[PDB]
C-alpha cells in the first residue's frame, strides 16, 4: 500500500506500477473512504530526505522505461532521450537541471567567503578539467592582488578574476555572456526574448552533448562487455550465466517477507510468462488482453 | 497529446502517396466521402468535420510491452546489433573444408597441418559463441545497474558536465 | 492465465523501487527518532 506521501508523488508520475496504486487509491476514495491528513511536521532535514527517497521511487521505474538511443544516427534520438529524462525529473519533483544544480552550488557554498573555497566545495559538481582551469586563473589573480580573492563580487579584485574566468568559459565553448543575461534578464520582453533564444540554443546543445556522452559510454561499455564475452567458449558462457542467475535467485529467496524480494520473484514469473506467451504465437507476440 | 486538438478535415491529406494503399476523399463543406482501397479490400465511409474532432478526445496512449524493461531491450538490441557486426566478419571466413582432403593432408608439413586443423577448430569456437544469442539478455543486465545508478543522482536524472559547467559560470560570474 | 493486461504489462521489472522503498521505510522512521533524541 501507499503511506499517503508516496501517493502524492505518484499523481503526476506516469510509470505503470505507480499509476496502478494511484488508480487503486482513487477507487477507494470513491467508495466512501476518508483521505488522511498530510503531516504538518518533519523539519527541513527530514523533509528533504523524504524528497530524496520519494523522487528516487519515481525516477527508478522511469529510467527503466526510457529506451537508450544506442547506435543511432543524428541528434533527435539523443534529444528524445534527454527530453524523456527531463519529463521524468519533472514528474519526480525536480526542477530544470539548470535550476537544480545552481541550487546545489548555493547550498554547498552558503558560508564560503573566499573563491578558493567555492572551487573546493563544488568540486564534485563541476568538471575536473574546468575546476582546474579556474584554479589556474585563480592563482594568476592570487599572485597579482597578493591576497585571498573574496567571494563578494562588488570588490574590484573579484572582477579581476571574474573577467578572466569569463575568458575561460568562452574558451571551453560556452557563451557566458548569454548565460548571465538569461538569469538576470532585461527590461523589455522583446530583447529578453532574443537572449532567451540564444540561451536555449546553448542549453539544448548542452544536454544533448551530455546525453550523447552518456550514450557513447554505454555503447563503449556494451562493446567491451561483448568482446570479452565473444572470446569465451560457449560452455564457459552457459555455466557462468547459470551461476550468476542462481547466485541472484538465492539472494532473493533467502530474504522473504521483504517487499523487494517478493516483487523480484514475481518478476521472474512474469519473464517466464512472456516467454510462454511468445511460444504460443510468435508472429503476434505476447498476448495482451483488450 | 494535450486535452484539445485542432486538426482534421481541414488541410487534411487528400490522397495517398503509396501504391500499396489508395486513398481518395471528397472534400465537401459539411462532410467528406473518403474511399480507402488497399489490395483486395475496399472500404468507403463518410466522416464529418465534427466527427474527426471527437477522435482525439479519448487518447490511445501506446506503450511498449517489453520482456524485462524498455531500457533493457534497448541494450539488448545494441548487443544484438554489435553481435551482427562480428557475425558479418565470420561470414567472410575462407572455406577451410575445401582443404580437408588427403591430397592436402599428405603434401603438407605435419605441423602446418596441425595449425590448419586448429585454425578450423577456432572458427567453430568463434562461430558457436557469436550465435549464442540467448546470452545477450544476461549481458544487457550487466550494463543496466551501473547506468541506472547514474540516473539516480541527487541533482537530476538528466544532469551532465556541460550543463553543470555553464550553470557554474552563472553562479561564479554573478555577485557572490 | 494467458492474456494478462496492459496496465501491468507496462511495468519495468527489475528496477529497484522497492529496495529504495525498503531503505526509506527503515531510514525515515529511524531518523525521525534520531533528531527528536539528539543532544551534543
Amino acid at each position: 500500500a501507499v503511506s499517503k506521501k508516496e501517493v502524492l508523488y505518484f499523481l503526476s508520475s506516469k510509470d505503470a506500477e505507480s499509476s496502478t496504486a494511484v488508480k487503486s487509491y482513487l477507487k477507494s476514495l470513491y467508495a466512501g473512504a476518508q483521505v488522511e491528513a498530510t503531516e504538518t511536521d518533519a523539519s527541513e532535514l527530514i523533509a528533504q530526505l523524504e524528497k530524496k527517497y520519494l523522487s528516487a521511487q519515481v525516477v527508478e521505474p522511469g529510467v527503466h522505461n526510457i529506451a537508450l538511443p544506442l547506435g543511432e544516427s543524428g541528434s533527435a534520438p539523443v534529444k528524445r532521450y534527454a527530453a524523456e529524462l527531463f519529463n521524468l525529473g519533472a514528474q519526480a519533483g525536480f526542477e530544470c537541471p539548470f535550476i537544480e544544480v545552481s541550487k546545489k552550488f548555493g547550498q554547498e557554498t552558503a558560508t564560503s567567503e573566499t573563491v578558493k573555497d567555492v572551487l573546493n566545495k563544488t568540486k564534485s559538481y563541476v568538471s575536473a578539467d574546468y575546476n582546474a582551469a579556474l584554479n589556474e586563473v585563480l592563482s594568476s589573480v592570487e599572485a597579482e592582488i597578493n591576497g585571498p580573492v573574496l567571494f563578494d563580487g562588488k570588490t574590484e579584485g573579484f572582477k579581476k578574476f571574474a573577467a578572466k574566468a569569463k575568458a575561460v568559459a568562452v574558451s571551453r565553448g560556452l557563451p557566458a555572456d548569454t548565460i548571465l543575461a538569461y538569469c538576470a534578464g532585461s527590461a523589455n520582453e522583446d530583447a529578453a526574448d532574443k537572449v532567451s533564444k540564444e540561451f536555449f540554443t546553448w542549453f539544448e546543445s548542452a544536454y544533448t552533448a551530455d546525453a550523447a556522452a552518456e550514450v557513447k559510454a554505454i555503447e563503449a561499455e556494451a562493446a567491451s562487455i561483448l568482446d570479452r564475452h565473444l572470446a569465451k567458449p560457449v560452455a564457459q558462457i552457459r555455466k557462468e550465466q547459470a551461476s550468476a542467475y542462481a547466485s541472484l535467485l538465492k539472494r532473493a529467496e533467502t530474504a522473504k517477507g521483504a517487499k523487494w524480494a517478493e516483487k523480484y520473484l514475481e518478476d521472474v514469473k512474469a519473464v517466464q510468462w512472456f516467454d510462454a506467451s511468445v511460444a504460443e504465437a510468435p508472429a503476434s507476440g505476447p498476448k495482451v488482453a483488450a | 497529446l494535450t486535452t484539445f486538438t485542432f486538426s482534421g478535415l481541414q488541410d487534411a491529406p487528400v490522397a495517398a502517396l503509396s501504391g500499396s494503399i489508395k486513398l481518395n476523399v471528397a472534400a465537401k463543406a459539411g462532410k467528406a466521402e473518403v474511399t480507402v482501397a488497399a489490395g483486395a479490400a475496399k472500404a468507403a465511409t463518410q466522416v464529418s468535420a465534427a466527427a474527426l474532432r471527437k477522435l482525439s478526445g479519448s487518447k490511445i496512449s501506446l506503450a511498449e510491452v517489453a520482456r524485462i524493461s524498455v531500457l533493457h531491450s534497448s541494450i539488448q538490441n545494441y548487443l544484438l546489433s554489435l553481435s551482427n557486426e562480428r557475425y558479418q566478419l565470420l561470414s567472410q571466413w575462407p572455406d577451410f573444408t575445401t582443404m580437408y582432403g588427403k591430397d592436402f593432408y599428405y603434401r603438407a608439413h605435419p605441423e602446418d597441418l596441425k595449425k590448419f586443423y586448429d585454425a578450423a577448430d577456432e572458427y567453430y569456437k568463434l562461430y558457436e559463441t557469436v550465435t549464442e544469442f540467448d546470452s545477450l539478455s544476461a549481458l544487457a543486465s550487466q550494463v543496466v545497474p551501473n547506468y541506472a545508478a547514474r540516473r539516480r543522482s541527487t541533482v537530476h536524472p538528466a544532469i551532465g558536465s556541460t550543463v553543470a559547467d555553464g550553470a557554474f559560470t552563472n553562479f561564479l560570474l554573478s555577485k557572490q | 492465465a494467458d492474456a494478462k493486461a496492459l496496465d501491468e504489462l507496462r511495468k519495468p521489472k527489475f528496477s529497484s523501487k522497492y529496495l529504495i522503498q525498503h531503505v526509506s521505510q527503515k531510514l525515515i522512521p529511524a531518523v525521525k527518532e534520531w533528531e527528536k533524541s539528539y543532544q551534543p
Binding site: A217, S224, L230, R251 | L89, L126, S141, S153, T154 | H22
Partner: peptide
C-alpha cells in the same frame, strides 16, 4: 537475465567514463 538491485545515489557529476576499444575486430581479422 536478472541484475542485482542497488539502492545508492550518485552525489557527483562526472563524465560517464568511456571504456577503451577492444581488439576483437583486429584479433578476428588476424
Amino acid at each position: 537475465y536478472l541484475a542485482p538491485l542497488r539502492s545508492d545515489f550518485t552525489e557527483e557529476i562526472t563524465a560517464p567514463k568511456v571504456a577503451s576499444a577492444s581488439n576483437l575486430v583486429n584479433e578476428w581479422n588476424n
